[PDB]
Design a protein around this ligand. Sequence first.
Ligand SMILES: *[C@@H](C)[C@H]1/C(=C/c2[nH]c(/C=C3N=C(/C=C4\NC(=O)C(CC)=C4C)C(C)=C\3CCC(=O)O)c(CCC(=O)O)c2C)NC(=O)[C@@H]1C
Lengths: 172, 172, 172, 172, 172, 172, 162, 162, 162, 162, 162, 162
Amino acid sequence: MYDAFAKVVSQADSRGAYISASQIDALSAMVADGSKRLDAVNRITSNSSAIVANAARALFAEQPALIAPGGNAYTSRRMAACLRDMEIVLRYVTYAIYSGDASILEDRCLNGLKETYLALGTPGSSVAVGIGKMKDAAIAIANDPNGVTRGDCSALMSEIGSYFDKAAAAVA
Amino acid sequence: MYDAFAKVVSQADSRGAYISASQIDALSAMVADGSKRLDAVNRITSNSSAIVANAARALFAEQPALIAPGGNAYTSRRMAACLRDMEIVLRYVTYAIYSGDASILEDRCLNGLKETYLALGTPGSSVAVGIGKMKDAAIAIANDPNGVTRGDCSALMSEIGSYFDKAAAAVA
Amino acid sequence: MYDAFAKVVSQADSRGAYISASQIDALSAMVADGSKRLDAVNRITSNSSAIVANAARALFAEQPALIAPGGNAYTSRRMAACLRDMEIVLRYVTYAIYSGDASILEDRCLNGLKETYLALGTPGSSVAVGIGKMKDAAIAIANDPNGVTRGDCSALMSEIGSYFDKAAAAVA
Amino acid sequence: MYDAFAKVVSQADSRGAYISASQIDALSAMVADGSKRLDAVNRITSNSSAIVANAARALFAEQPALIAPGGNAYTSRRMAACLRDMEIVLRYVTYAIYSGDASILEDRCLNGLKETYLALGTPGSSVAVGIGKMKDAAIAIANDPNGVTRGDCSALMSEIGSYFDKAAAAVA
Amino acid sequence: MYDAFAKVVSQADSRGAYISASQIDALSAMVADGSKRLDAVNRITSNSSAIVANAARALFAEQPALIAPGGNAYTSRRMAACLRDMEIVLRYVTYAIYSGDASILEDRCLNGLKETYLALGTPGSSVAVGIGKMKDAAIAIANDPNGVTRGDCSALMSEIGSYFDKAAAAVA
Amino acid sequence: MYDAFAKVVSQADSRGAYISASQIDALSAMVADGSKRLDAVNRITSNSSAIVANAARALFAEQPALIAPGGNAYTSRRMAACLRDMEIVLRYVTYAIYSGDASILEDRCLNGLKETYLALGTPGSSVAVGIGKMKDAAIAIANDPNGVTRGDCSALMSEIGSYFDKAAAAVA
Amino acid sequence: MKTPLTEAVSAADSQGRFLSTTETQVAFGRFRQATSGLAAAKALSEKAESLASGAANAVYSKFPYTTSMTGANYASSQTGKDKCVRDIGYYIRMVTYCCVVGGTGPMDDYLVAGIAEINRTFDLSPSWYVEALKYVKANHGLSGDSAVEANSYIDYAINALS
Amino acid sequence: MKTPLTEAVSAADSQGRFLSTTETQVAFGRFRQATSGLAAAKALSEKAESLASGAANAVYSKFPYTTSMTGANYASSQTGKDKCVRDIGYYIRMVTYCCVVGGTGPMDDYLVAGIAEINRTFDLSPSWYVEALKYVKANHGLSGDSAVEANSYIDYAINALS
Amino acid sequence: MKTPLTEAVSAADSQGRFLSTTETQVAFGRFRQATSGLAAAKALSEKAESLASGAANAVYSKFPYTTSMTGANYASSQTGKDKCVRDIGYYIRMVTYCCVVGGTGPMDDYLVAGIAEINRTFDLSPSWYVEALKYVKANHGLSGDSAVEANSYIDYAINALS
Amino acid sequence: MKTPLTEAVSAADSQGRFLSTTETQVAFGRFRQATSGLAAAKALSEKAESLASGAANAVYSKFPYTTSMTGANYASSQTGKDKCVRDIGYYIRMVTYCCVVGGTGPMDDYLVAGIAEINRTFDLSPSWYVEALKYVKANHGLSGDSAVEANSYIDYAINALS
Amino acid sequence: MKTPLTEAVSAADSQGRFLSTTETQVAFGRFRQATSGLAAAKALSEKAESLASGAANAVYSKFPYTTSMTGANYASSQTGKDKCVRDIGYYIRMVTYCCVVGGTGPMDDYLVAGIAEINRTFDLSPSWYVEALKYVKANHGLSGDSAVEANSYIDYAINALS
Amino acid sequence: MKTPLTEAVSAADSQGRFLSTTETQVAFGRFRQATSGLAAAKALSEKAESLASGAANAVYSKFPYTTSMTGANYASSQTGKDKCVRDIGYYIRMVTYCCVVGGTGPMDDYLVAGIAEINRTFDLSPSWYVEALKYVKANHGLSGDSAVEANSYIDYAINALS
Ligand SMILES: *[C@@H](C)[C@H]1/C(=C/c2[nH]c(/C=C3N=C(/C=C4\NC(=O)C(CC)=C4C)C(C)=C\3CCC(=O)O)c(CCC(=O)O)c2C)NC(=O)[C@@H]1C
């Protein structure tokens, strides 16, 4: 995987180039927002169980066919695998937030997921819905002004949302 | 794999359904003939070496090309593999007779077997001929009225034939 | 793998045939030139590191793009892999020379290699060039008239040349 | 492992002897009490979770030092391992009851156990107490006259008791 | 392994106690001088190859018997092994300095080492001498007032010496 | 393992010495007996099945307790293992003869064999008797005056006997 | 899935062996149980609806807070009550399946593997289900081998939850 | 036990490598955190007894049945109430340990590994403990990084239970 | 040793499972089989001496050269004749053991594993033993399940030899 | 296929090494022996027809029942005699191959591997073939090193059958 | 590639864990370091050409034979001098990349892995590069943490070469 | 230790087989080679002292800085000169051992395995030894097979250093 810093370096090496004063400024920006970034990671993580459970409950309520006998989420083993997948995606998304780069999420989580679900007969559109519900709940908790020094986290939230969207689009 | 009972349950669970009074009668019929089924398994199994050897001998006699220098059954190693395959197919067929379902035969013996033979240059059609000779010998042994309480095993012999035919058709 | 003797046998067996008095003559001729064969192997092997180093140097001199940043041979890891490949091919070629048969070279070195380089983005035509430089250097050392009993090894150098050419054609 | 039948056979073969008419009668006798034996296994097994929990609870009440901080049963990991040991012993005892021979319990559970506890600092005598508690509970449940065809299981209870004692004795 | 903080926690848990306000101050101390500790680790590590090389040279100069033919450090394989051992001990000592606890060193390096040496015929007393030389050099490098903010590192050097002394005493 | 030449080298290197006179010219002597050595290996090897079978038959004839029920050679699996060991010892002895050094026999065959037999209840004393019988047969075959250029193979037979004697001694 | 018959086959297959009288005994034991097993499945299926609602009410009675405390995990709403009756019906249906195949296979494949994760995630108490299973055992009205067998699987679920 | 320092060493060791500036950064991060961490450990220790008893009472108020229902798993006896307050004290003490080492290591090693088995066997509801944990979070009186860090461990435990 | 009972136990143990109704069925099959199994063992044992002698004579008649040709592998000598009836008695005895345990286990452990090596080394023909086994089968005098079971073990041996 | 040369190469390969003087000595040994081996192979292929026929007759003489006893595994029929002569011809041809490559390779690949399964299934006696092989060794008319080499391959096959 | 952040993620991922305060500390340490790290990378890139040329001359001065002896591996030709300043430029650039990510990762991935094979194959002495690297240290004109960090990566390369 | 004979045995042993005419050919090759090999070993030994000092001088001529530069790794002091002639003597002695056993085994076991580490650690250039080896080759005075074999080992060492 790459973090934000390593991504720049790898694109520089293939050019035999030094990191530009420009790219340095962009990395300096990320560093300046570093504490906000870790607050977001801590907050989403500290609510991981509820985020998954609440998103799954809502999903099954909107799509009762998923849990009716014969449905993909029917039986304990399948229900548990479903909940596990939700937790997995949330986990890899937080890795991407922490690292400031999507490679971890794409490489170790999204790669081949669509095709896996195809082979199993798991409905990807439904997974994408579950992922979007986690996204909204996660940003909501991350961006709550209560209990944190006041300041603007808008760019971070837009970045957080892009990682969730990438996950959803990978299986939609 | 499934046996006859498990097959019915799996089909019911996907519909969220209790097994019907009708499906029950059908399972009762199998149980009623259970001793006949076990005699058949015992008898074919107790003659496994002869059924293989005799079927192989007759095969090579009908098709001298198989054992001629250059033939697929030529050389000790290839003849041994050939005899092994005959015994493997017979063995999996008896498992099917025993469990009252073809799944064990399909899943662990026949799946990918055509492809395998094709890639080796092993003549599937000749294998099918061998299997058919084993089938005829097996049914004659299983349905021999000597030394067993007299009754009607025609349904069972039909079922036994169907497994051998499934094997033959998978490679022919 | 086959050596020259084993190759003949394998062709005879599939025909159920004894080796001909003619094929024996041929093998007899190879045995006759056996010491020349071993000189060539010893001489090439004894200069293996220089053959690889000098060929590699010449390749990169002729194709600087290979070692420019972003080039397939740029970075120590990729440079090291490239040198390794050179050594590997030379090694398998000497194996073929020693056994008087290309099977070892085909089976354990060349088979699938073109596809490997394609997956990697490694330029096979550049590998072909390196392989040809090694060939020129190997034949020059093997065919040096100094310090050996004088005789004609022309047929041997052609055979040697054919193994290098087989290698170069496989990756081109 | 041996079951009761195999045990007698192994002793006979070392003597080159046929099993005696009297040994056969003894086997016939255990066979005659087979369904009693099976009821016993089912009853004990069907209460495995309660037998373990109740015996552990009473053990800890008797020896508070076990659960005081710094005790061998203190911390969740040690408590869990302790419960697991209790369930393992119960499980292997039921295997002994089922097979009518102590070999399974001896070979796969008790062998090297006293030494393991000694190394760990686990109090063997405390485990023995827990096992004795399981014995009393298990026998009381196995020998309950309600809900079963009335008869004498006194020989069976003595055998069962003997397996629990053997386990207790191995770590005391 | 434990670092300094974890060691204190484990001692506290075994008594079911909150760490003593006293214990808190001692850990807070390590924290206060953390920058110094990390300078020491950086400097020693930054001179690792030189520390090993010079200490080994010195050892062989003082004990020519080690490198004479038939000597334990004679032959390239044994010399390389000897140099490897020196580097391994230095590395594990730096792990102990970084973590502020000896457990990593004792558990993954020193445990079983004397016995390994006795079995091989490696003279542990000689290894101990080489280790002492590494110690004197490591502390000299770590405690050099040039190129660092001036201050007192005496307590740290004493801790560092203790780890090296631990390693030597284990094989002496 | 060492062969005779390698053993000499290792003794020399431990003293940092070039090959000595007593070692040199001598080795020349072993080389000069090389064809006789290979006659012995070929003759013993070419009769390996008979040497094992005849020696086993004579051992069991002499020590009937080995094959009576309860004997260590009783049952097919034990008989088979017994014949295997005899074949194995003979095989390793031939390696010793061929290489002119006992190290192959000691390192891969004899080391820990005595202890293995003691753990299994195999009577080493009886194994030694079987080995002695193979020795006598093997030497008679190797030293048969018929079908070979006549000469003195006495020193060789003495060396061969010593390898057999080492093997018998190791288990007796 | 696991049944006495498929287990017998898997054991033989793993050793590369034809079947022998060992597996014949397994089958004769299976065929002996099947009649009373199939009878249990039949009778349970006829009482299923009544057993499930009766068991649900038994849980509410023992744990009365489950019908008043606010939360999606509770049967204080009609939705929650219906979930609960559905779940108990699942346990009953699984018990019939085990009776049909002569083993815990179906219960394992469809219900027990993963059950702990479900109860943790959705905040459902295993004790609730244990009480439901106890009621079923008290009210199925089976007798003889049909009851012994059905109870073995009910008690197996109870052990899994405790 | 896992801490930021032992994990850095573990990673280097598994690669057979000397420590580098990567591990130096880990330690600087640790030393930046450690002071506010030890402060939280100390504050919690002083309030531990009050927090545990207050948390127990909060549980009883949320789930009154835990003080009336009969059974060794409930706080309907003095022995049961004592067990409960003990248990909550354990949680609080594990949190201070986590603050001392800068990670979940102590909670994992001493409490979380095996907790599910304990709760299943002794019939204790994870929900009881989540409520108790929410009380300590609302009452420890920490702020700044001391609160942020302490709460991350409390929430980690809540996550383990749900 | 493998028996229907040890095999049931082994299967459960490998899965870390308590026994269940699945293994109950195995035992009921075993107990149903044991009556006639034990009867076969007793009756064979009583006829053992006569079956072994009669079987060796049937072999001598089928393969006359076996009492004619010289060689340690033949029954042309008294010693050879004694080895032969001894060997045949071993087979009969193993059959009795198989009937006692309800499986091929004793036959496998004591006789079949390694039989190929023995026949190769000592130049014994498998077909001699097949003939012997056919005679035992035609002359043991068993009926019903006793005969079916004993014959299954005899045929098992014949299979392993062919 | 194994030969002195391919085994020299195989050893070097698995160690990732270039060939050395060690392998040169292997090839020098091969090339020296090859003259004799090739001579043996030519001469054998010329005597093969009458050697195979003569060896069959030697087997019939040693084992008279082989031409009187009824059965597909015997040479009591013309088809049986033909199979037998063919088989022996197979052994002789493999021996020529071995002389050609300087090792047991061809004989292993094409005949020895699986031979035990063939003789078992078709009820052919290894002793028949040992007798044929002895006849071949005593009558091939080779001398000196040619004979010594061919005899080693013949005795290799005998060892394999015994 | 390795950085303090990707190593934290990797450790967590290998354990199937969410990030915790442990990894938060890693990140704070990273962020603390990055400002001086980026400054180092900035200054070095601005002085890179001067540093590489200066270091090459330092090498030629320490080892004069390197500009006198003929051979492609030496700097006695213009091509050789150009190779040498190029190589030193590579080292310097790698040091900047390490400063950017806060670890040895880039230098390992792009330069150190395989460096041994290159120097052996092309007959280049590590001591030349060690001398070059010492020049860079003595001349980059860095101060404070920027220097300590850059020097750490330079010394890392020296260690790898020695 | 690798030699033609131990390699032959190792190959047979890994396949659990007796030796065959294949290994006989290996030994014949070894035996025919040994005369020339033992003669090379004797002659090299007799010139050993002269060759080592001559070789050392050759290295000093080709790399003059080696006798002028200050450093423990150089031959500027008598001590350094003595180390150097000793090392070269080691190479020559290993060459004689290779000639004794007919393979690279001695040189691998005692010198080549770990040589890279030694040269890196002590800052010794492979090129110095390559030059020493070139001198030995040009000055040993060997002819015929003795020279070809001895040179094979010298070139093998040169390859290992480059
Ligand atoms: C063509 C490649 C060149 C050539 C070869 C050539 N060689 C010989 C003769 C021999 N070659 C050897 C080789 C070795 N002897 C060894 O001991 C070793 C390793 C230790 C090797 C590799 C030997 C022993 C001989 C025979 C004795 C001799 O030295 O002459 C010939 C002569 C014809 C023949 O086949 O013997 C030839 C032609 N000759 C050339 O001119 C080419 C440059």
